[PDB]
Amino acid sequence: MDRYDIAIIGSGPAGLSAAINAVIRNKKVILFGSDNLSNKLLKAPKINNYLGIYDVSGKELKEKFLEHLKYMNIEIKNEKVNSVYSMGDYFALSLNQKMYEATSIIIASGVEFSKPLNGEDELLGKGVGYCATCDAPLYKGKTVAIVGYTKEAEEEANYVSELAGKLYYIPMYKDKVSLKEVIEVVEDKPISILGKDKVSGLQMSKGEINTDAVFIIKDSVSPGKLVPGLLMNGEHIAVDIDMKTNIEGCFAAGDCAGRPYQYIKSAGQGQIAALSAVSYIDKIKLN
Amino acid sequence: MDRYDIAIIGSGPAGLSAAINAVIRNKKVILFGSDNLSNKLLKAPKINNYLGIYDVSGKELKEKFLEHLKYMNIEIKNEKVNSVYSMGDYFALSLNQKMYEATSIIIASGVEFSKPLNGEDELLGKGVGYCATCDAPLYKGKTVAIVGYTKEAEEEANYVSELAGKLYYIPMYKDKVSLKEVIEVVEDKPISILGKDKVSGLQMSKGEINTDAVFIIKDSVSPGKLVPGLLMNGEHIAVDIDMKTNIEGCFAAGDCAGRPYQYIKSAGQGQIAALSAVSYIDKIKLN
Numbered sequence A, B: 001m002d003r004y005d006i007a008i009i010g011s012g013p014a015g016l017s018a019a020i021n022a023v024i025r026n027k028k029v030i031l032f033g034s035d036n037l038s039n040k041l042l043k044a045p046k047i048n049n050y051l052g053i054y055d056v057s058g059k060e061l062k063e064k065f066l067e068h069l070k071y072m073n074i075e076i077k078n079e080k081v082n083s084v085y086s087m088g089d090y091f092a093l094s095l096n097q098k099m100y101e102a103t104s105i106i107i108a109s110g111v112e113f114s115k116p117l118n119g120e121d122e123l124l125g126k127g128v129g130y131c132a133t134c135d136a137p138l139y140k141g142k143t144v145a146i147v148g149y150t151k152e153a154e155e156e157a158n159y160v161s162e163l164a165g166k167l168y169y170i171p172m173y174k175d176k177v178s179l180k181e182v183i184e185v186v187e188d189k190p191i192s193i194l195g196k197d198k199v200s201g202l203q204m205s206k207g208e209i210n211t212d213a214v215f216i217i218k219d220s221v222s223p224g225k226l227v228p229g230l231l232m233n234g235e236h237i238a239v240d241i242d243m244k245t246n247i248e249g250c251f252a253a254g255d256c257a258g259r260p261y262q263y264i265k266s267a268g269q270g271q272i273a274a275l276s277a278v279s280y281i282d283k284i285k286l287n
């Protein structure tokens, strides 16, 4: 019922800069993402290319960002947006068992280095999912595999382990996992998701595992899948100089809007996107 | 003789972010501008829209920028670039009695709120100039008028006063001037620069003053005049998503590249422009 002026999908520097600039402009904003902001921030050892803050690690830089947000009284909604559809003069954002409305949206979701697997596109919705928490009630007691591209997937696996019967976890990183002992860790490369009507198993380089469900856990999903109808230029959202996309009222910023992948470029684009959204909102009210 | 990899025209956040990113990438950079960085920084009372540094005045923000530059061992050349011409596979930058060469250039000069006067374009070079120091040797002992749009013009007027015979100073701001007593301050609006073959006087709303020279002192000049052959979109340089202009090896960033006029947008574009210049330089060496 309550409708936000701007919904911002992503909590890296693009989304945070967008949120601060929109709030400064008296708009009602909702900011989706992670309390950690971005795992790519957390990873960086020393950063000397963000003008005005130098010789800082990514963790120190994240803290400065967090302090700014709290000064501005901006809260991050720790929920993952699964899809966005236009409904005419607003957008409907769908999350696990929850929907929000916003007049405009800013996509600030970053990019994913890895490329999907064979069968992810075909099986999506047919045993394949990107949120294992939302789909954990389905296939309860069944056999589940989680392909974890981020450390947070481990947390989802530990919860899923209690509903499902037999859980496999495939880590896509070298850091040792912290999982309940009953979870079977498979240290192998996934190749393809098997099944015709529904997923029947997970094909790996060293073997095949029969499974009811395969959950794919990454820090983001492709914008063209998040927002059907959004025009892409290869791996990136097509944008103009004002960060406008082909969808009216939909703007983009940061890595998801193209190379170079850098923090202050992302913050600058987030500010452009926010000010374009402000202009759009104002024009919509007049007409 | 010595040729720089990148020449950056401007020392606001766009130019500074460009310089830091180019140096981080092992390029030989020259950075032109002001030790004060930008008068627009110095003016701002409180700034809460630059992600990571909050509740700061423009002077505090300028100091953080200066500290970063010194950490990176980057020096600002306090000279005003008057023109840039291509010479084939490099650019020639002309200053008062000095020239530099660079393989690529980044225009980061900001924008000027005021619009020129009648006769500025026609008389330019014929008694009209934008640097009163470079043109002070000419018309020595003659009658000079300076139209000052910035406080630094006062400093130029105090020097010019000693060569010229009779100097008028027209302030375009309300702050009281600090000038040698022999300088005649005219508190009136300039309308037009008079003359046919050469400037003959300065027409004001309340009267006309006969003069040999009219010097127009602003924080920047239009990019289309700085770099003849550069394509403009109205008041701004035409750029693409990679900050490329119509001139190969010439990039732009910040206010001069379009609205919104904001600090972190400018810093982000400066970073894009620097990384585009790095790519260009590398491609030029291979071919």
Ligand SMILES: Cc1cc2nc3c(=O)[nH]c(=O)nc-3n(C[C@H](O)[C@H](O)[C@H](O)COP(=O)(O)OP(=O)(O)OC[C@H]3O[C@@H](n4cnc5c(N)ncnc54)[C@H](O)[C@@H]3O)c2cc1C
Pocket (backbone or CB within 6 Å): A009, A010, A011, A012, A013, A014, A015, A032, A033, A034, A037, A038, A039, A040, A041, A043, A044, A045, A046, A047, A048, A049, A050, A079, A080, A081, A082, A108, A109, A110, A111, A219, A220, A221, A226, A253, A254, A255, A256, A260, A261, A262, A263, A264, A266
């Ligand atoms: C190791 C490393 C070091 C680096 N060092 C530097 C450096 O020194 N300097 C530099 O300039 N750049 C550096 N980078 C690159 C920099 O991290 C990125 O350019 C920058 O983080 C891009 O930020 P962003 O806001 O576009 O997206 P991200 O930082 O990726 O933030 C996106 C956030 O939004 C979340 N999100 C995505 N989709 C959704 C959804 N549907 N719902 C809810 N939340 C979602 C993501 O989980 C993520 O938390 C480095 C990158 C790496 C990997």
Ligand SMILES: Cc1cc2nc3c(=O)[nH]c(=O)nc-3n(C[C@H](O)[C@H](O)[C@H](O)COP(=O)(O)OP(=O)(O)OC[C@H]3O[C@@H](n4cnc5c(N)ncnc54)[C@H](O)[C@@H]3O)c2cc1C
Pocket (backbone or CB within 6 Å): B009, B010, B011, B012, B013, B014, B015, B032, B033, B034, B037, B038, B039, B040, B041, B043, B044, B045, B046, B047, B048, B049, B050, B079, B080, B081, B082, B108, B109, B110, B111, B219, B220, B221, B226, B253, B254, B255, B256, B260, B261, B262, B263, B264, B266
């Ligand atoms: C009063 C005020 C308050 C503001 N507050 C805010 C705010 O809170 N937040 C915000 O985001 N933005 C704010 N802005 C806008 C912000 O200042 C600009 O968007 C930003 O400074 C643009 O920076 P830039 O690097 O593009 O150019 P500038 O900041 O204009 O820097 C250009 C510099 O390069 C120099 N230069 C130009 N041409 C030449 C040449 N040929 N040779 C040598 N040097 C040259 C100029 O003299 C100048 O020093 C404010 C502006 C004003 C006027």
